[PDB]
Amino acid sequence: GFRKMAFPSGKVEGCMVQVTCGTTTLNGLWLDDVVYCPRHVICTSEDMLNPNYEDLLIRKSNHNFLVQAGNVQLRVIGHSMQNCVLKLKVDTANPKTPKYKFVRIQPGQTFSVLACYNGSPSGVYQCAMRPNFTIKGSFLNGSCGSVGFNIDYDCVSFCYMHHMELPTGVHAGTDLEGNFYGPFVDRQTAQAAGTDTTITVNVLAWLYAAVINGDRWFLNRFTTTLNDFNLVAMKYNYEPLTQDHVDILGPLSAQTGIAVLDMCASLKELLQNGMNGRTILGSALLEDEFTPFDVVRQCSG
Amino acid sequence: GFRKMAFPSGKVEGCMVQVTCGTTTLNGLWLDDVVYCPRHVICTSEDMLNPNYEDLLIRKSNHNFLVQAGNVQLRVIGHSMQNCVLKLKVDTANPKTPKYKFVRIQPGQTFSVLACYNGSPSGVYQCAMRPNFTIKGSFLNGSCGSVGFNIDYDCVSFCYMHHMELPTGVHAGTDLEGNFYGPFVDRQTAQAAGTDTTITVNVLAWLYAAVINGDRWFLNRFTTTLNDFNLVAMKYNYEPLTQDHVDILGPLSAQTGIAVLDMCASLKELLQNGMNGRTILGSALLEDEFTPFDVVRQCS
Numbered sequence A: 001g002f003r004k005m006a007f008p009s010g011k012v013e014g015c016m017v018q019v020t021c022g023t024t025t026l027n028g029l030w031l032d033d034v035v036y037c038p039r040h041v042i043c044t045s046e047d048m049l050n051p052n053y054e055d056l057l058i059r060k061s062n063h064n065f066l067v068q069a070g071n072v073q074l075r076v077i078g079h080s081m082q083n084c085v086l087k088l089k090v091d092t093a094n095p096k097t098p099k100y101k102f103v104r105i106q107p108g109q110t111f112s113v114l115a116c117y118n119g120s121p122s123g124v125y126q127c128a129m130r131p132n133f134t135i136k137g138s139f140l141n142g143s144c145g146s147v148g149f150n151i152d153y154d155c156v157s158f159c160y161m162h163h164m165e166l167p168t169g170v171h172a173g174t175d176l177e178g179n180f181y182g183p184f185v186d187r188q189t190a191q192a193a194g195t196d197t198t199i200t201v202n203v204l205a206w207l208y209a210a211v212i213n214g215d216r217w218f219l220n221r222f223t224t225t226l227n228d229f230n231l232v233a234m235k236y237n238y239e240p241l242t243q244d245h246v247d248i249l250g251p252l253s254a255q256t257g258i259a260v261l262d263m264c265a266s267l268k269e270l271l272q273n274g275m276n277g278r279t280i281l282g283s284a285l286l287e288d289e290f291t292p293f294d295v296v297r298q299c300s301g
Numbered sequence B: 001g002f003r004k005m006a007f008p009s010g011k012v013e014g015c016m017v018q019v020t021c022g023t024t025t026l027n028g029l030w031l032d033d034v035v036y037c038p039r040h041v042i043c044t045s046e047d048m049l050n051p052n053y054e055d056l057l058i059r060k061s062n063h064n065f066l067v068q069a070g071n072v073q074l075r076v077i078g079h080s081m082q083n084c085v086l087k088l089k090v091d092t093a094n095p096k097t098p099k100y101k102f103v104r105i106q107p108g109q110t111f112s113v114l115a116c117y118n119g120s121p122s123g124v125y126q127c128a129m130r131p132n133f134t135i136k137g138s139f140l141n142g143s144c145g146s147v148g149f150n151i152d153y154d155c156v157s158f159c160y161m162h163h164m165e166l167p168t169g170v171h172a173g174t175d176l177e178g179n180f181y182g183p184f185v186d187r188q189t190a191q192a193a194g195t196d197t198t199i200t201v202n203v204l205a206w207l208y209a210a211v212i213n214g215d216r217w218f219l220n221r222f223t224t225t226l227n228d229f230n231l232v233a234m235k236y237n238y239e240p241l242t243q244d245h246v247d248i249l250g251p252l253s254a255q256t257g258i259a260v261l262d263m264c265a266s267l268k269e270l271l272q273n274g275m276n277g278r279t280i281l282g283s284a285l286l287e288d289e290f291t292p293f294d295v296v297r298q299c300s
């Protein structure tokens, strides 16, 4: 009874533009009078094999950047590089700018991606940041500069800007200050995703969701300490819990009356014993890409 | 990778408004100077058990309808009813009205849903019209009047307006002419759907998606005729595959070098032997809510 739901994308659609240098076009994000985009737009395909970004940029001027909203050019009046993002000052404040902030998310957190090509949105879908700092997205050539976001009340929190596709078909990128998630660098040289793990806090959220819906055969009579649970979980390639994880499970723990550590003890028994052919929420697989906020957002509205 | 992907919802967000009658509140769709919404907004709790809608509606006045676009009330200057949809004429045009049309979709087709509450957009996701004319949505109290749609070029094709949830947790609603998909009625009584089936052409498209993304453990060296495949399909409550379906799958067959009927032979083996605890594109079940067009677009 659960599905990945994206946030409504309109507030972000109103911020997408295209940025071109020479023949390289990608997407940018226009907020107030600044356009944010991946810095590799300044690279020729041959530069991308081995770029010196400081030296490539010092040779650029405002008049080398073509920024367009649709087919309408936005004149660039300044430029600077902040980590792996380029910031282009433009002479028009975007009238569709929403209330916004820039946030750096943690593994396990989910967000919506608005996949764009040539400044035009094509589709929206929900992603989770994996513990290895990749996302399992859907991106083609020309998608760089597409962004990921959450919407809280009136306010768009941008958390991801897209830069790269790894050999295993997963994706990597930066926050809006240009800092990559994970060890990746914006160079066209062989790179690989590390070994991934299961997002424990989200599996627990999923078990809480099952309980809310009356599916609770897996609740046991025991508890555990956080440290004992973390040490066991790692033997099953599950992530250890942080204090922040315990706290973000607070609302679901209060809603169900099941202490976080009792649920941990139930999960430990599932890991140690298996499902024994039973299902939870209709599935024999434990889901790890629904956060506690996602569960609340779909169970209680 | 390969994700369930919805259309960007902005063009539809600019059309959602809130409609209240009495203590009943739901969403409407504001296009030009008309607001469309489910007619059961005019019902009280008592009315919903057995509503004579023409009789209930004649007793309403324009001023009984409170329409709000954000923090602005829109004055209703006229109303009519078209099947299960109420059309409220308002004194102001929506400047955010997109290019649009109203279409009635076929079972197996997919669309995006913009789930809304009190006229405010809440989430967007992809659904398919099931063969039994339900949809597996995520809708709560206050979601009625949320709409489903596709976007082609700049044109929004509205295909679904939400009205109800069935005891099994699936959903039912109408096209924008107010006619239900399926044998359902907008009355507060328990209703069951016909036996559902699996959308075979969509399962095949998703198998081809799994191969494009380098996952082909399920393939085999065998083949099958169209009719022999269909005999097995129907036995497992899968929809029949037509020659038009085979034709529609051509691009995906060309892209991958796997003849359609060879992929049919693969699916036959999956149906007869199961997945042996294995997974395809992360799923432990055969997914049937991607169309061939959906797969092609997201891989092109």
Ligand SMILES: *[C@H](O)[C@H](C[C@@H]1CCNC1=O)NC(=O)[C@H](CC(C)C)NC(=O)OCC(C)(C)Sc1ccccc1
Binding pocket: A026, A040, A048, A139, A140, A141, A142, A143, A144, A145, A163, A164, A165, A166, A167, A171, A185, A186, A187, A188, A189, A190, A191, A192
């Ligand atoms: C920007 O639009 C583009 C998005 C990619 C293209 C296809 N799908 C995507 O998500 N980004 C890139 O092409 C990126 C640019 C550099 C970071 C400057 N290159 C890239 O992602 O290459 C990946 C490698 C070379 C780092 S790893 C790899 C992947 C496949 C095969 C071999 C090696």
Ligand SMILES: *[C@H](O)[C@H](C[C@@H]1CCNC1=O)NC(=O)[C@H](CC(C)C)NC(=O)OCC(C)(C)Sc1ccccc1
Binding pocket: B026, B040, B048, B139, B140, B141, B142, B143, B144, B145, B163, B164, B165, B166, B167, B168, B171, B185, B186, B187, B188, B189, B190, B191
């Ligand atoms: C409109 O916002 C509302 C949407 C529903 C609410 C919960 N999820 C939805 O999708 N629509 C209705 O509540 C609808 C109004 C009638 C058409 C007049 N009623 C409705 O959907 O009720 C279904 C039931 C309760 C009659 S079927 C059932 C379900 C569980 C147990 C027993 C019977």
